[PDB]
Amino acid sequence: SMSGSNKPSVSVLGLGAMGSVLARTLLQAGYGVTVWNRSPERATALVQEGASLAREASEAINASNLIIICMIDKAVFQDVLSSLDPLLNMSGKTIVNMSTGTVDDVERIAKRVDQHNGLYVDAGIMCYPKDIGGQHTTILYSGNSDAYHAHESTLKVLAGNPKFLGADPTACTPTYLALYAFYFGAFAAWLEGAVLASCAGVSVQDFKALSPIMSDMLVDGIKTAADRIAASDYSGEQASVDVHVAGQEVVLDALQRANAPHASTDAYLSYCRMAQTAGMGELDIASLFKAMH
Amino acid sequence: NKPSVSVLGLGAMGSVLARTLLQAGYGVTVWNRSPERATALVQEGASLAREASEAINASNLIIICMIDKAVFQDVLSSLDPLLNMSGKTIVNMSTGTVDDVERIAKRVDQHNGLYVDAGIMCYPKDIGGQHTTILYSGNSDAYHAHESTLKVLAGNPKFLGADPTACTPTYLALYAFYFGAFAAWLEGAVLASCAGVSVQDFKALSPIMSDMLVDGIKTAADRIAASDYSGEQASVDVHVAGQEVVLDALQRANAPHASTDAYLSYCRMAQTAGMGELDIASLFKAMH
Numbered sequence: 071s072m073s074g075s076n077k078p079s080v081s082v083l084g085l086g087a088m089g090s091v092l093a094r095t096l097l098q099a100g101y102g103v104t105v106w107n108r109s110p111e112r113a114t115a116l117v118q119e120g121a122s123l124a125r126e127a128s129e130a131i132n133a134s135n136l137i138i139i140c141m142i143d144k145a146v147f148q149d150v151l152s153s154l155d156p157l158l159n160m161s162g163k164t165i166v167n168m169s170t171g172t173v174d175d176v177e178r179i180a181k182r183v184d185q186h187n188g189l190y191v192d193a194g195i196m197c198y199p200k201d202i203g204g205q206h207t208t209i210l211y212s213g214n215s216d217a218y219h220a221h222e223s224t225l226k227v228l229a230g231n232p233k234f235l236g237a238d239p240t241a242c243t244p245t246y247l248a249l250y251a252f253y254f255g256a257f258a259a260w261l262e263g264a265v266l267a268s269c270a271g272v273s274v275q276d277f278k279a280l281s282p283i284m285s286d287m288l289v290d291g292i293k294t295a296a297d298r299i300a301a302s303d304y305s306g307e308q309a310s311v312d313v314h315v316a317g318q319e320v321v322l323d324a325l326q327r328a329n330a331p332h333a334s335t336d337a338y339l340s341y342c343r344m345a346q347t348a349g350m351g352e353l354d355i356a357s358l359f360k361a362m363h
Numbered sequence: 364n365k366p367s368v369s370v371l372g373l374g375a376m377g378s379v380l381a382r383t384l385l386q387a388g389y390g391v392t393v394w395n396r397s398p399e400r401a402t403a404l405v406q407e408g409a410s411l412a413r414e415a416s417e418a419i420n421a422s423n424l425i426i427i428c429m430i431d432k433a434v435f436q437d438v439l440s441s442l443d444p445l446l447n448m449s450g451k452t453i454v455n456m457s458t459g460t461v462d463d464v465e466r467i468a469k470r471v472d473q474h475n476g477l478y479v480d481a482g483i484m485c486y487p488k489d490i491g492g493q494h495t496t497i498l499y500s501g502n503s504d505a506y507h508a509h510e511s512t513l514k515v516l517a518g519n520p521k522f523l524g525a526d527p528t529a530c531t532p533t534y535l536a537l538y539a540f541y542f543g544a545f546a547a548w549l550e551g552a553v554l555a556s557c558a559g560v561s562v563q564d565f566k567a568l569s570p571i572m573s574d575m576l577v578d579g580i581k582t583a584a585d586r587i588a589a590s591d592y593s594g595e596q597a598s599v600d601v602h603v604a605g606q607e608v609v610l611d612a613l614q615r616a617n618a619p620h621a622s623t624d625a626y627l628s629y630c631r632m633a634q635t636a637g638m639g640e641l642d643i644a645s646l647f648k649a650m651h
């Protein structure tokens with residue numbers, strides 16, 4: 071392939087907000103990078119910094135033995151595969167798909183890559199572009215173990231704290247989507263609180279300064295609730311579901327009187343009421359897991 | 364030479380406030396509507412008051428931890444008007460509305476008491492913790508006079524100002540965040556479980572997202588302060604396209620998706636307002 075500082079070639083397909091930064095990060099670490107994007111405008115800055123732009127997705131695939139996909143979704147990578155010569159030889163090449171998509175997409179893609187004699191790793195980026203290259207940054211991976219481990223050092227340029235979740239190409243997606251269900255539900259909750267605080271004359275900077283109290287409590291609460299769910303041990307001596315409900319009905323009242331949105335609080339109260347309906351009123355809040363299952 | 368403290372309300376939280384004070388060598392007088400709950404505290408050296416009145420009379424620091432502020436207002440209302448609270452600081456750690464706080468502060472004033480409203484930012488197991496927070500607002504002189512005593516309950520107190528009503532909105536805003544986030548975690552843990560991921564394995568991965576959220580809060584708060592919603596990190600539209608895949612996974616697992624629906628409703632608010640291309644922090648402007 072070649073190098074420069076004796077590093078192998080990598081290809082990046084998709085140069086949006088995330089893909090462009092994957093390419094730049096590899097270039098800056100001394101990797102040869104071939105890029106491809108549906109629209110060529112996005113490649114100009116990368117080309118000026120030493121990337122090669124491929125005219126066709128096929129040429130980007132041909133250029134490297136490590137092919138990183140970061141398009142809007144897995145479905146559009148299926149369309150890219152469909153426009154390849156069916157006999158394009160991907161022997162010795164590892165496709166790493168970092169695009170958001172369904173387990174059905176992953177299954178279809180793994181099959182098509184296998185038909186080309188390629189190796190397939192599914193992946194999920196657990197950060198915003200600004201944190202790519204971070205020692206603490208996580209990308210999730212699942213699929214061909216030999217292929218992942220062969221490219222592990224290269225992929226570590228993008229994220230210093232990767233997690234290999236197992237050999238099943240479909241393992242990454244459900245975990246990835248579950249962690250982002252948590253992340254964005256929690257981020258909406260934070261906004262919902264920041265808006266209530268603001269309505270009471272607490273600046274967003276002052277609410278930011280207090281937020282770690284609750285981030286620390288949530289780190290501990292997740293540990294606590296996970297250990298209880300593992301043990302099916304929902305004894306209510308810390309706090310009952312019923313007391314959680316009485317308290318959060320006061321939070322709702324405050325949101326309604328502030329004319330602040332309360333969709334996140336409505337969601338939590340609905341899960342509480344599920345648990346009460348199931349006779350879990352006296353139990354620990356961890357019992358919501360069983361009521362929700 | 365430690366002073367007397369009184370605790371009224373010996374439920375899950377109040378019992379531990381009383382126990383923590385006893386164990387630190389404070390004289391503690393307890394009261395509870397039902398006497399069964401006082402037995403464990405009497406085992407550990409507490410004096411039991413027959414009436415709420417006597418618990419208030421017993422000490423110059425009176426800590427309330429009843430189900431809500433409304434029932435403490437009812438206890439106050441049934442006191443003899445000649446009960447004298449001169450030199451006494453009432454600290455109300457019960458969840459309640461700003462209207463409850465206003466009524467209680469008035470009644471305490473009528474008895475010549477000093478009033479501090481408070482909000483406990485932990486479960487009972489974390490009471491006594493050096494990093495544990497209780498929020499306080501109201502009489503500054505009274506709070507600071509009792510600050511050493513109250514520190515034995517929580518080593519990281521926050522005094523939020525002299526207005527007795529200051530604590531409640533911040534307290535409720537932080538719990539809006541905490542329980543919305545906890546429901547989101549449960550929503551994810553159930554999805555993972557439906558795909559055969561053990562709750563212990565989901566617990567082990569959760570810090571990835573807790574760390575990302577600590578950074579996301581800082582980032583979003585700085586953008587909201589600056590009204591700077593430039594979309595170069597990720598657009599609302601890309602957030603929506605991604606979370607519609609999360610929603611699909613929940614629907615196909617027949618798993619609940621109310622927390623995801625709430626986030627997507629805020630996203631759709633922002634899109635409708637023409638913020639599709641902006642940073643996710645723009646949801647604040649769409650919401651407020």
Ligand SMILES: NC(=O)C1=CN([C@@H]2O[C@H](COP(=O)(O)OP(=O)(O)OC[C@H]3O[C@@H](n4cnc5c(N)ncnc54)[C@H](OP(=O)(O)O)[C@@H]3O)[C@@H](O)[C@H]2O)C=CC1
Nearest residue numbers: 084085086087088108109141142146169170195198597605
């Ligand atoms: N940005 C972020 O913070 C994060 C992003 N992700 C995930 O990474 C992926 C990419 O996100 P991001 O860079 O923000 O998205 P952008 O919208 O910035 O980029 C989308 C990319 O997909 C390409 N694309 C869209 N439609 C097609 C198509 N039909 N054929 C070929 N290429 C197409 C775009 O090409 P063009 O330039 O021609 O439009 C562009 O390269 C998503 O799946 C996202 O969920 C993961 C975590 C964080």
Ligand SMILES: NC(=O)C1=CN([C@@H]2O[C@H](COP(=O)(O)OP(=O)(O)OC[C@H]3O[C@@H](n4cnc5c(N)ncnc54)[C@H](OP(=O)(O)O)[C@@H]3O)[C@@H](O)[C@H]2O)C=CC1
Nearest residue numbers: 309317372373374375376396397429430434457458483486
């Ligand atoms: N547990 C926790 O983790 C946390 C609790 N809190 C707050 O602290 C408060 C107490 O919670 P918690 O200890 O869990 O609740 P519990 O239900 O365990 O205790 C409630 C207490 O209120 C008393 N009570 C109820 N009705 C009356 C009444 N009419 N007159 C007098 N006393 C009455 C009960 O007396 P009786 O024993 O006779 O029923 C009991 O002492 C709530 O406002 C809650 O939101 C805040 C932070 C965390």
